[PDB]
Amino acid sequence: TGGSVHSSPAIGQDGTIYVGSNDHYLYAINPNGKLKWKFETGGSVHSSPAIGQDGTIYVGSNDHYLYAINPNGKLKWKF
Incomplete structure (x- = not known):
């Protein structure tokens, strides 16, 4: 990812891994x-x-x- 991560990953039902990043993205990784x-x-x-x-x-x-x-x-x- 860009920058860094103190966000903990979460796993979807299809195995996708989601994690946030210091570079302002939520990543979805296979x-x-x-x-x-x-x-x-x-x-x-x-x-x-x-x-x-x-x-x-x-x-x-x-x-x-x-x-x-x-x-x-x-x-x-978005709320």
Whole structure:
């Protein structure tokens, strides 16, 4: 990742690994180590992500907002 990470990873049901980064992204990494996608948030993601029953990924951000991201990496909403 760019920068660093004190965010703890979370695992999806398909084995995707999600982790935030100091460079402002939430990363979705495949179990083979290859990037699936990275979602651009407004600030450093030290929050650990949580995964909903439908696969939605939730993470907090140093800016305003809890983010809800679809498994395809597209914003569902920000609070």
